[PDB]
């Protein structure tokens, strides 16, 4: 009965018509519906990427007309605002494909969102404590391109007693256990691995090191500029070579096990070039 078929792949929560995300869902879906006839269907169909320009959102369209809290919501909430755009894109593409098929089924895959051209440039030497889980932007060069190695995000588990195996959404590549199995009824446990079924999904990975430019503040002290890492996730990779001039926008998260001793790295969300 859910209009959005790809609910399971997107937000993992029991469907209830009470969340405030719904209004943003209609806002984004209307904005995409009006501006829909300018995208090559094959490119999005193969590689999920909608290169939405932030200036268009800033232009005072329905995005701000329906809800005015867009910049604050984007900065404070990293994922709730970001994934709604992907949900809207998936829904509108599914509806268009269904209409086209009906005029003359549909299993469109995961599509990521890409919000670039972010104006306030929060350059380095100012990201220490406060900027944790806040969408920011940088500018620098690349010097330490590394090799590719896959990782898994949705590897499956075995089931106890009867069948009904599951594909528990394991978070950020850290092994855990499903102490509860929803299933129909009865006890959980079922702690066993089944790393052969097609339920397990994998994707690429990389790592980039950025050295920030000379900019200003020509201090005589020979302190080399600070460096912060990056992590490309999917549909990226081989997009940079040693020595460039790139602009990176992404969430700021905190690593572990460099023991409450951590560092700071940035999970990329869009890259440019020059």
């Amino acid at each position: 009965f859910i209009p959005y078929k790809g609910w399971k792949l997107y937000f993992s929560e029991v469907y209830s018509d009470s969340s405030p995300l719904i209004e943003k869902i209609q806002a984004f879906e209307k904005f995409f519906t009006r501006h829909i006839d300018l995208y090559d269907k094959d490119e999005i169909e193969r590689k999920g990427s909608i290169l939405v320009d932030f200036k268009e959102l800033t232009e005072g369209g329905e995005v701000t007309n329906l809800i005015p809290d867009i910049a604050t919501e984007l900065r404070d909430a990293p994922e709730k605002t970001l994934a709604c755009m992907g949900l809207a894109i998936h829904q509108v593409l599914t509806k268009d494909l269904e209409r086209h098929a009906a005029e003359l089924m549909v299993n469109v895959p995961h599509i990521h969102a890409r919000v670039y051209n972010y104006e306030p440039l929060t350059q380095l030497k100012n990201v220490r404590a406060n900027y944790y889980g806040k969408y920011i932007a940088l500018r620098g060069t690349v010097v330490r391109v590394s090799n590719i190695k896959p990782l898994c995000t949705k590897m499956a588990f075995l089931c106890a007693a009867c069948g009904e195996i599951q594909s528990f959404p394991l978070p950020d590549g850290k092994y855990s256990l499903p102490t509860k199995c929803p299933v129909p009824v009865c006890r959980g446990r079922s702690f066993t691995a089944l790393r052969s079924s097609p339920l397990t999904v994998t994707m690429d990975w990389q790592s980039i090191k950025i050295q920030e430019l000379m900019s200003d503040d020509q201090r005589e002290a020979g302190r080399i500029p600070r460096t912060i890492e990056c992590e490309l996730v999917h549909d990226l990779v081989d997009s940079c070579v040693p020595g460039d001039t790139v602009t990176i926008t992404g969430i700021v998260k905190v690593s572990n096990a460099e023991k409450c001793m951590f560092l700071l790295y940035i999970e990329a969300n869009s890259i440019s070039n020059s």
């Binding site: 090799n147 590719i148 190695k149 896959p150 990782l151 898994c152 590549g173 850290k174 092994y175 855990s176 691995a193 790393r195 052969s196 994998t202 994707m203 690429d204 990779v237 096990a257």
Partner: protein
């Protein structure tokens, strides 16, 4: 798969090998030793041209086709032994193998670059040179361990996806509710680096096995027709699991 599909593939393979592969089978039969190893080379394009259904059944599950072709070769060996006129200078071998070669020139099967993660379970063809070379070593395959608390013996096998480790069984497949090294192979490890002429390139850890061991020279051009599979690692609590991409060889060439 369906019951009839594997059978039909079997008759197609046996008919083809009987019609156009009598000579190599005859030479293989007329050889000394009993259980060393003996391969057979079969072309592809003619086989896929003869029937338009073998290709569809083949190029989505490169797993059952090789075993079915091996069984067809064994049945052909039994048939030719039964219908033989000079049973003096002959010997029967129970270790036969398949080797496919001669794939089409489709852009998605002659890839000159290493697949990243979207080619798992596919039949590919990579080209490159050789960098490193390991030592010849021997594995243990199957144990047939002692039967405990029940009667019928077990024939559990190893697992390639867990670095050849053995899992302890506890649920016996016995009909009732009751439930509780004269075998060897070969091994090697070779690394292939992509050529720069047709392009920094990365490398693959190609795993050789069985008769293909000791068939590569350090610093030569290769062309492998192998399947792509994944190798896991034992899980530690609250860490990042590690995976890798390897290429189990099914043929080889020394083209230069």
């Amino acid at each position: 798969m369906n019951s009839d599909q594997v059978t039909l593939v079997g008759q197609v393979f046996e008919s083809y090998v009987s019609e156009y592969h009598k000579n190599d089978i005859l030479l293989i039969l007329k050889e000394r030793d009993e259980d060393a190893h003996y391969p057979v080379v079969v072309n592809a394009m003619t086989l896929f041209e003869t029937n338009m259904e073998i290709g569809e059944y083949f190029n989505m599950f490169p797993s059952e086709v090789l075993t079915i072709f091996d069984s067809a070769l064994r049945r052909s060996a039994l048939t030719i032994l039964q219908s033989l006129s000079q049973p003096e200078a002959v010997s029967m071998k129970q270790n036969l193998h398949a080797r496919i070669s001669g794939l089409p020139v489709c852009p998605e099967l002659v890839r000159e670059h290493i697949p990243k993660t979207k080619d798992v379970g596919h039949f590919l063809s990579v080209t490159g040179t050789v960098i490193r070379t390991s030592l010849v070593k021997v594995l243990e395959f199957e144990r047939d361990y002692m039967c405990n608390k029940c009667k019928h013996v077990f024939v559990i096998k190893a697992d390639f996806e867990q670095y050849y480790t053995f899992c302890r069984p506890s649920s016996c497949p016995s009909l009732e509710s009751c439930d509780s090294p004269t075998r060897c192979r070969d091994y090697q490890e070779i690394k292939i680096q992509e050529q720069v002429q047709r392009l920094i390139p990365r490398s693959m850890k190609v795993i050789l096995e069985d008769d293909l061991v000791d068939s590569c020279k350090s610093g030569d051009d290769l062309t492998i027709y192998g399947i792509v599979m994944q190798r896991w690692k034992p899980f530690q609590q609250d860490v990042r699991c590690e995976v890798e991409i390897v290429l189990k060889a099914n043929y080889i060439q020394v083209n230069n």
